[PDB]
Amino acid sequence: YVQAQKQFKQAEDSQNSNTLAKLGYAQCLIARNEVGDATIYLEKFFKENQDSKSSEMMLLLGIIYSQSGKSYYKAII
């Protein structure tokens, strides 16, 4: 998980257009139980890329917000 997350970060730094690398980075954050860190990274990516059609990213955001509970409105959206 540490090595995979580092590799995903290096992939993102090499070419920022690789959305799949960032999604794998978030998945690795989830793997390391970094719920808050993954949430912050996902919010940063979504706010920078509000027009991106990453359906799985939005599904993961909704699941995370439902687990949080207070952010139900973003989860619905």
Partner: protein, 41 residues
């Protein structure tokens, strides 16, 4: 005062507890299945 007999008693009695049927949490409502589903390759 010999007039009409009537008693006034406001009714604000609390009802008995309902004990409604309980919802069952989904499998994705538990932390471990959530972790397994999100960490899918």
């Amino acid at each position: 005062r010999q007039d009409y007999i009537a008693k006034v008693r406001y009714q604000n009695d609390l009802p008995a507890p309902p004990c409604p049927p309980k919802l069952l949490k989904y499998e994705i409502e538990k932390e471990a299945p959530q972790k397994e589903f999100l960490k899918d390759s």
